[model samples]
Target chain A: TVWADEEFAGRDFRDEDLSRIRTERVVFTECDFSGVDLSESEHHGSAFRNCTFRRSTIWHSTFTNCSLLGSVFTECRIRPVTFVECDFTLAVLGGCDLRAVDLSDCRLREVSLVGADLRKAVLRRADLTGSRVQDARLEEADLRGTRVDPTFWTTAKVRGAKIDIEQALAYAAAHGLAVHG
Target chain B: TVWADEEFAGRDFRDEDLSRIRTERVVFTECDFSGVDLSESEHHGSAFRNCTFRRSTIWHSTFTNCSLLGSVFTECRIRPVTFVECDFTLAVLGGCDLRAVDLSDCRLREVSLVGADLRKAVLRRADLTGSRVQDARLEEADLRGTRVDPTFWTTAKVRGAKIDIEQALAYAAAHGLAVH
Candidate 1:
């Protein structure tokens, strides 16, 4: 309840303390939130468009219907955060540890997830079109109903990963094997 | 009824023609069946102990309750043979093509199966304790209810292979994972 209907444009927030602040329908455009502590913050209907989150920490935060379009997060520590129906279109989350996080229904299209540790994560029904997953470890991650291609099976380490029966057919055909080889 | 209740000991049959012959309760001890044509032979309740079968062709043959104890087979062309309740204890079947063959209820303990092609073979309930499977290929082979170890998963190419759920647990632990 700390922020509602507030508009923050081109605001350079470095080493700022904005932890545990709740936001509603707040818009932050072209804002640089470097070294900011946004831990335990709950955001709803907030849009952080074209923002830079460098060295920022967001632990135990909650984002429901939040839009983070075109945002670049370099080396950001996001531990155990909950995201529901969030739009992360064209966002870059390189070198982030998003293990065991629930990202279901999140529009992560054209996102850069390189060098991300997404082990045991739940990305069900998340659109990952044109997303980069080089060196990403997603062991035992739930990816059922995902909008990724069959090539993701070999592109990432997906041993014991959960998927639906329909997706299983696509993944099995990726290796071109069904007993007749 | 070519050979029944007859005992052939120390017989060296070379380039012999015994095709479509039927044998019952016959014992051939220490016999060498080299260059012999025993095609379409049906053997029942027979024992060929300590025998050597080299270059012998046994096409479409049937073996029921036959014992090949301590026998050695080399360079033999065995095509689509039916084996039931056969005791192959201490037998050598190296480099044999046993594709799509059924060997149910067979005693294959201490048998040498090196370099053998067991693709699509059904070895249900067959005991393979102490058997050698080095260089063996068992792709698409059914090993349900068989007496084999869990190490058989990595010892051979087990792609598209069949196994029971009870045995699947042991195989899963063989690789130290089942999703914790």
Candidate 2:
């Protein structure tokens, strides 16, 4: 368990094995974590601004209130990760497997999740306005109170995805169903 | 100009330029037209059953009532092609550039159009049941009366696409808008 309040700015941590590390209030700005193994790590109140996590493995990690603004994570293994209240705005998560992960109350504005596996993931109250989610798997995902673009429901898989009452009414109207309310 | 009925089954016409040729009632079953250039060709009532047109160029071609069942056209250039009343069931058209092509009333059931460029293509009443259209560019494409699964709208680009009233309602719902 590596606990430190370190600032890793513009650092190259590629292919580094950082397993089971516990970081608190660490700032990682513009750092490259590509091909890095950060499995079973616990990061609390950390900031990862403009970081690149391409091909990184973060299996079973726990990140609470970690700000990942503008971070790109292409082909990353993020299975069973717990990201409670993380700010992921403008993040690119292309081809990542985030199945059954908890991302409730995350800020996901303008994020790209193209071809990512998000089956059964929890995104309740997460704002996804202007996010590009093309070809992303959303089977049985929870999206209650989430804000999304009007073109998202027609373009992304929302079968069995849970939405709010207002969203449900809109869905009924779109499917030619008349609502009396 | 082959005006009569011709049987070109199981033929290897690969890398051949058959441009500006007029063929009627041609049967091209199980033929390989890979890397062939058929630009400006006029094919009337041609049947391309189980054929392979991989990397072929078909710019400015016209096909009336053509049957392309079980055919594959990977990486083909199909710009400005006229395919009126074509049967494209179980066909594979992955990574092809089909911008501004007229494919109205085409049978696209179970077809694979992954990563294909279909900007401004005419697909009125096209049946795309059980087809794979992931990553296909569909900007300004006409999809009126087209039968597609709800999941396809989520995967493909439908900006300015012409859809029916029901599809419009779904779009409104997807965008978090209240449609009265």
Candidate 3:
């Protein structure tokens, strides 16, 4: 069903198969999407503020121009998902499996990513400033043009992450190396 | 006059003007060229082994295929000089002004360059391994295609010196920066 211009607050969508459901200009405040199957679902101009997505299977879903502010994603199997022009500010994606996902040009300011598996993910030109990354696995991830502090080199686990020369210089400088030319 | 196959050992030619002199296969062992003006002199296949060049003016001189082995140069004015295919092994050029000089393809292995001003000098494809560079200034110097150790980054004063991206990575790796 193509839901548009509607408000669904505090609704329980647990273990429901909402696959291929399309939404536009819809607001779902504090809605429970735990254990839900949202595969192939496409959302546009939708707001999911403070919504819960625990153990949700969000495979092949597309979120375009959506506001997911303060939303919580715990133990979610989120891969092969497409998110374009999405605002994930202040969102908590704790322990989420976001491996090999492309989060390019997304605004994820202050988003909590603790224990997230972001291995081999393409996060190019993503605004990740003030984002929490404790215990996050960023191995072999493409972090070129990422907007993060120099301390992110020492704080994040970037074993084989691909970075530019400027980022490499920052990594060396962060480790107390004199990077003057 | 072109001097060929001659050895003027222990000759005291001090404070003399020997400008525009040409040499071919000549040897000047331990000869004193102190305070002498050797401007525009051309030398080919000559050896000035263990010679002293104190307070000499040697501008616009050319030294081709010459051996300056064990030569000590103290307080010499040596600019506008052309050194083609020269070996400066064990030569002491302490406190010398080699600004804007092209010393490319030269071997300066383990040579002393203490307090030397090598500003704007081009050292392309040069072998400078184990060179002493204490208090040496390399400001705006071209270090491209030169062979140097990793410790040369910290030992020499390289203010605004030219370097490639690979050299920058090498500089970081040498200091244990973990740029992997």
Candidate 4:
């Protein structure tokens, strides 16, 4: 909690064991967190604004109340990730295997979960407004108190997940709906 | 209906009161509508994909069931607008003045309304999931039947507006509220 404003912009933190580091209010603007072993990291109140993290391993990582605006995670491996009260505005989590990920009480705005494996994920009380989750597997996932856009839900692949019957029926109404160009 | 698939790409429709223009299913790829006046325009079922409408005026327009994907309306004036059953998916309305706009039964998926003036706007049954409206002015705005993340209610400001008290109370309860 006593770290000053350090400019770690565009610096590579790859393969480095930052798992046990207590990052508080540290600004990693435009930094590369690719391949960094953040499996055991506790990023409490840290902000990774506009950072690019590709193919990184974030298993069991805790990002409590953090802001990840405009961050890109291409082909990353994140499992059992916990995002408690975090801001994922404009974050791209495309092509990631996020099965069983617990995203409770998080605010995700315009976050792309395209091509992610979200089976068995706990999305309780998660606001998923404006998120494009195309081609993602949401089977057996808990969606109680989950807010989803009807357009997003219509385009998403939800055949594998366990969802509410009412929700499924609502999505069923828009089945085979396609936006013509 | 006969304007379907018609290309109006890279065309300028600015400052022209298109309120009475009845064009449906018209393709508007890369069209420039910046600073154009479209007040009271009847644009039912019009398609304006990937168009740039920065700083345009869209007040008192009827955009019923229209598709406006990937259209950029940066700093545009959108007051007194009625968007019934309109699809605004991926439409960027950053810094736009959307006061007194009606978006009933509209699809607002991932629509960017950051720093926009939404005073007196009506958003009944409008799906605002994942849409960020931070630092927006929603005084006199109507939020009936609108869905939003509960965590955003406290940080946002809305005064002299008509809203669903049940939903507002639920949002207030979710994020500790302070009434002024």
Best by TM-score: 1
Badly placed stretches (over 4 Å) of model 3 are A1-181
- TM per prediction: 0.67, 0.50, 0.56, 0.45
lDDT score for residue B11 of model 2: 92
Given candidate 1, what's the lDDT at residue B64? 97
Q: What is the TM-score of chain A alone in each candidate?
A: 0.92, 0.91, 0.92, 0.83
Better of 1 and 3 by lDDT: 3
Worst 10 residues of 3 chain B by lDDT: B171-180
Instruction: Provide the DockQ value for model 1.
Output: 0.10
Candidate 2: pairs in clash = A149-B175, A150-B175, A154-B153, A154-B154, A155-B153, A155-B154, A155-B155, A156-B154, A174-B169
What is candidate 3's lDDT per residue for A1-181, written digit by digit as tens? Answer: 9999989999999999999999998999999999999999999999999998989888899999999999888887788899988889999997888889888888889999889889998888888888898888888888888787776777778877877677777665565443445
Residues B66-141, model 4: lDDT tens digits? 8998899887777666777988888998778777777778888888878878877787778878777788777767
lDDT over C-alpha atoms for residue B109 of model 1:
93
Candidate closest to the true structure, highest lDDT: 3
State the lDDT of candidate 2 residue by residue for B117-163, as single tens digits.
Answer: 88888888888888898998888888878888767777778766777
Question: lDDT tens digits, residues B38-132, model 1?
Answer: 88999999998998888899879998999999988778888689898999999988898889989889999988889988999988899988888
Supply fnat for every model shown. Answer: 0.03, 0.00, 0.05, 0.00
Give a tens-digit lDDT track for model 2, residues A54-151: 98998889999899999998888888688989999899997788888888899999999888888888888889888898998887788888888766
CA lDDT scores, all candidates in order: 0.82, 0.82, 0.83, 0.71
Candidate 2 positional error at A119, Å: 20
Model 4, residue A9: displacement in angstroms?
2.8
lDDT of each residue in A47-76, candidate 4, tens digit only: 888887787777777788888998998876
Query: Candidate 2 — what's its lDDT?
Result: 0.82
